[PDB]
Scaffold this active site. Sequence first.
Site, PDB file in Angstrom:
ATOM      1  CG  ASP A 181      -2.313  -0.588   0.934  1.00 19.29           C
ATOM      2  OD1 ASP A 181      -2.491  -1.327  -0.061  1.00 19.29           O
ATOM      3  OD2 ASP A 181      -3.240  -0.330   1.736  1.00 19.29           O
ATOM      4  CB  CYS A 215      -1.048   1.238 -11.423  1.00 23.82           C
ATOM      5  SG  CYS A 215      -0.241   2.670 -12.154  1.00 23.82           S
ATOM      6  NE  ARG A 221       1.443   0.487  -6.776  1.00 22.32           N
ATOM      7  CZ  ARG A 221       0.447   0.096  -6.001  1.00 22.32           C
ATOM      8  NH1 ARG A 221      -0.445  -0.777  -6.427  1.00 22.32           N
ATOM      9  NH2 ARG A 221       0.343   0.598  -4.770  1.00 22.32           N
ATOM     10  CB  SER A 222       1.759   1.861 -15.357  1.00 22.78           C
ATOM     11  OG  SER A 222       0.509   1.265 -15.028  1.00 22.78           O
ATOM     12  CD  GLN A 262       2.187   8.397  -9.367  1.00 29.82           C
ATOM     13  OE1 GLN A 262       1.430   9.319  -9.036  1.00 29.82           O
ATOM     14  NE2 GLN A 262       1.867   7.117  -9.201  1.00 29.82           N
TER      15      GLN A 262
END
Length: 284
Positions: A181, A215, A221-222, A262
């Site tokens: 998370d 994502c 994450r992508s 990110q």
Amino acid sequence: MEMEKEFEQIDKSGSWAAIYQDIRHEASDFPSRVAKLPKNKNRNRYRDVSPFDHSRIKLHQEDNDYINASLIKMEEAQRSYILTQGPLPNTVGHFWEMVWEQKSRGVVMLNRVMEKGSLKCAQYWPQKEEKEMIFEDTNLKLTLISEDIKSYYTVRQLELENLTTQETREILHFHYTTWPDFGVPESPASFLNFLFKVRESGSLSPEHGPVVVHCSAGIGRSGTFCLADTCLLLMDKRKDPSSVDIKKVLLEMRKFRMGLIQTADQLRFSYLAVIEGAKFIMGD
């Protein structure tokens, strides 16, 4: 410079936040006018994450061709990817229209439907074989064929039928279910294991349309997934694998979608995954 030495240099000097801000400053800025039209407000999950006009995927419909999705075309590596947000309650039909129209074989999902107690994307595939889904706005039917649940990921076989023509295709759904998370994974081993399973399936290969990867916003994450895959492929192709420059590859990919990677933690993790993945691409 060997990225592995670059890595230790940044790590000992604790300058990851500084490297990452340099990338943000040099990244491309292109218009995203279509994304910002008032008619498309309910097609965007996040007000500050939009596809550029020049690289956006267009839906094949006269009504409204807009979806929050971008084509990342890597010319030297000879790989293409579609990066998209997690589908919204009112865009699940558009999502499967895109998969159909772009002739994709695989969908890669890097998030859970609920994270941090909030919904991160719609339940856009069926959970039981006998309960298929029909998308009336785009005239598609979607059926679960089989499900293989593993410790770090789940792979699903799906049937997508164009109800207009009755053609059917097999789509493979690769669901990475264990990204934490908060933060990034401690080891890249399970992420690399997952990447190699996607590769083995054919879903990244030039005989198919581009893989669809998402994502929640389709950039963090992508971005990590496609950055690691492309860097490893370049190390395979070139005479000099230490010539692969991960920062330069990331800036090339940011010509096609904003905001890829990110956080400085995601940048460090991308380095770790490429360095450890290299110890296969060279023979072992």
